[PDB]
Design a protein around this ligand. Sequence first.
Ligand code: NDP
Lengths: 243, 233
Amino acid sequence: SFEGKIVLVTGASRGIGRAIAETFVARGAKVIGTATSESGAEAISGYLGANGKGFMLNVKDAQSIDSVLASIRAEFGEIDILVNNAGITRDNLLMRMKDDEWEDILDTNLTSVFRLSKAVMCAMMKKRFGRIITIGSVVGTMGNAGQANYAAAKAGLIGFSKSLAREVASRGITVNVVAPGYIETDMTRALTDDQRAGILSSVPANRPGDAKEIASAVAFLASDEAGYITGETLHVNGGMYMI
Amino acid sequence: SFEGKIVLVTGASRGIGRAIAETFVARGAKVIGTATSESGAEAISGYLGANGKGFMLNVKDAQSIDSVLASIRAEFGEIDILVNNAGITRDNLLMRMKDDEWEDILDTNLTSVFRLSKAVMCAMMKKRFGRIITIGSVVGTMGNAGQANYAAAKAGLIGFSKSLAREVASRGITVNVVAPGYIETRAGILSSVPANRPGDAKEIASAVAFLASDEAGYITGETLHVNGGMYMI
Ligand SMILES: NC(=O)C1=CN([C@@H]2O[C@H](COP(=O)(O)OP(=O)(O)OC[C@H]3O[C@@H](n4cnc5c(N)ncnc54)[C@H](OP(=O)(O)O)[C@@H]3O)[C@@H](O)[C@H]2O)C=CC1
């Protein structure tokens, strides 16, 4: 149960993000989800109801971050659990990878983790409790052709998390990463059956993952039953990669 | 043997970068080292001698990168072996680390690997041979307090190399990372090294040299840990 916990979930409009926010709502938390557009911000508030609210936040603008967090501080309070789920893919083979594509991935998926962790953990330290969970990817451990930018960012937040964990572990704050595998989004249900079966051939579980299965893992690491788990990567990929 | 191969080592003024550049010269290659100062550049041209040359290179400047590459391709030729070694530290506990310190580590230690690997790989693919080695750090794997920016960049270049290795493995190019531990450039950190001694700069060079050789054509997407037991994977 998360009765009393203030939970921030970046990128919460759909898929993993929404399933994460929906899980915390059902377990008694005050859940704050973000989208990149005001329409998404208001769409989050609709399905969050009275238990939470949606905000428009861009993880690449420090001004947008100071505003939303202050807005969160006024109408809700200090964040107890931060779930970094802002993240995009800008696929290309390296010889075709443009600069802005590399820079966009590092600012959206890696620098975002540094900036939001810096802003929430001052309160987690004085309250001697905190949870910082970032959604990485199996690509960060396994690598993948055409996603050198993506894998660099997803692996970078692991080293970041391990370093931050060592800094704050003695103050009741744990910093962890959930690494999803093949999860069924709407873009999953939109590729050809030839494509679908191709990825499944490398999944021993012989099925795509479900967004709530990532939410279950995020929920566990955030629960108070995981105070001794810090600097860890929890892989949820159905056996696609085994570490 | 490295006869007929052209090597480029970024950041080869001193320490690990120098030992790497000197090792490739000692095994028959034509070597180019880079520094940020025209000072350190002429220092590299000095110790390389008639078998190599130094260049001033700022990996955060795209004009500097392309200019040095043009010179190398005109004076020496296409680069066969890229050793990514440019790197800096600006440590701070996270709530004390200003955004500039996070920016500089990523731009210098991570984005530099993407820029120069991309710039050299087109010729490597046409030759159907290539070696890309990036000097990482034990910190990128074990993590370290006050070094979240350094660790994130060092961990990120491993995710980069794994993906790139999958892209070019079939065309005779391998992409690997050498991860040093405690290398002498207190005893409190030597208390964490079971070897009970610091590593030598040339001990990293021997690693890099092994990966860059034709004997290591089947090693790709791998991190070789040279740390004396500080971390074990
Ligand atoms: N020392 C250790 O224990 C460890 C070292 N490493 C890494 O391995 C390498 C060891 O070399 P080390 O002697 O430690 O570090 P150096 O003291 O040799 O300086 C690192 C190199 O980076 C170059 N450099 C700095 N900024 C830039 C830039 N903006 N553009 C291009 N080049 C730049 C420097 O050139 P100049 O001489 O012009 O500054 C120098 O040659 C480093 O990359 C280090 O991070 C890995 C693990 C631990």
